[PDB]
Amino acid sequence: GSHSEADNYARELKREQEEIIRVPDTEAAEVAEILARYGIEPHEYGPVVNALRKKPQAWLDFMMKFELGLEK
Amino acid sequence: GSHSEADNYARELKREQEEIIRVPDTEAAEVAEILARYGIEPHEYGPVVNALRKKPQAWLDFMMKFELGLEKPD
Ligand SMILES: [Cl-]
Ligand SMILES: [Cl-]
Ligand SMILES: [Zn+2]
Ligand SMILES: [Zn+2]
Ligand SMILES: [Zn+2]
Ligand SMILES: [Zn+2]
Ligand SMILES: [Zn+2]
Ligand SMILES: [Zn+2]
Ligand SMILES: [Zn+2]
Ligand SMILES: [Zn+2]
Ligand SMILES: [Zn+2]
Ligand SMILES: [Zn+2]
Ligand SMILES: [Zn+2]
Ligand SMILES: [Zn+2]
């Protein structure tokens, strides 16, 4: 049967959301490590990682785009 | 025929470095716009911009990824 472009993204969205709920500090470490790739130091990237944790839907969007390479 | 021309990556990498040299303030403003989409505030991303500016090679790869959706190979 079908494979909706909608369905693939909802499949990938669901998996990532469940990781944020079950292992949030691990997901926060994924952000830190992406930003550290560009020689940004913890004292510099820290507040961005903290800003995302406080906005779970934005944090989920950020992972979808910058960890998984996906768009809406 | 078979294709060998400098790919989208090669061309955008050329274009993106020239911007960084010629209109760095404009490329800094692009990072602010990108991180602001995810609810981040200037006092939060300001230090990240400031660090990217001091590291031209890091900054180029940042823009390739966060602006243009392209990974650095290998
Ligand atoms: Cl939110
Ligand atoms: Cl550098
Ligand atoms: Zn089928
Ligand atoms: Zn099938
Ligand atoms: Zn994941
Ligand atoms: Zn993740
Ligand atoms: Zn994960
Ligand atoms: Zn051909
Ligand atoms: Zn052709
Ligand atoms: Zn081609
Ligand atoms: Zn372009
Ligand atoms: Zn550009
Ligand atoms: Zn740019
Ligand atoms: Zn530009």
Side-chain angles (χ1 to χ4, degrees), chain A residues 1-10 12-72, chain B residues 1-13 15-74:
Chain A
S2 274
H3 297 233
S4 173
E5 199 202 26
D7 274 318
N8 277 104
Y9 185 87
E12 228 51 58
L13 186 62
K14 194 160 84 82
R15 179 176 173 201
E16 190 64 14
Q17 176 117 59
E18 278 172 1
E19 295 182 300
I20 292 166
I21 292 152
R22 291 200 218 92
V23 292
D25 294 283
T26 299
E27 285 303 311
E30 282 171 10
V31 182
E33 189 246 66
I34 285 166
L35 290 182
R37 255 178 235 157
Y38 307 94
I40 309 163
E41 301 266 298
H43 75 270
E44 302 167 325
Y45 68 66
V48 165
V49 179
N50 184 66
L52 284 173
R53 293 189 75 122
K54 291 201 284 225
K55 302 197 189 222
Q57 280 175 234
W59 179 16
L60 170 60
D61 287 346
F62 183 111
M63 320 268 84
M64 294 304 280
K65 199 165 223 344
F66 303 135
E67 179 204 349
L68 298 192
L70 300 177
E71 38 178 2
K72 312 160 170 212
Chain B
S2 73
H3 293 213
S4 62
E5 81 283 351
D7 52 32
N8 190 60
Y9 185 77
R11 294 203 150 101
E12 288 287 46
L13 186 69
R15 175 171 298 96
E16 206 60 28
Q17 196 163 208
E18 305 334 317
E19 291 172 307
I20 282 171
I21 287 149
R22 181 180 49 79
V23 291
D25 279 351
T26 290
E27 294 290 323
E30 275 162 21
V31 178
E33 201 159 276
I34 294 159
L35 296 181
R37 287 185 207 128
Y38 301 91
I40 303 147
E41 288 311 327
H43 67 95
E44 299 164 332
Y45 59 65
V48 166
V49 167
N50 169 84
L52 288 172
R53 296 185 85 127
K54 294 180 175 184
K55 292 169 132 178
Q57 174 64 262
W59 196 5
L60 173 52
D61 286 318
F62 192 95
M63 301 303 113
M64 295 294 277
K65 184 163 198 338
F66 285 81
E67 189 198 339
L68 267 34
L70 298 158
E71 302 292 316
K72 98 174 280 150
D74 283 4

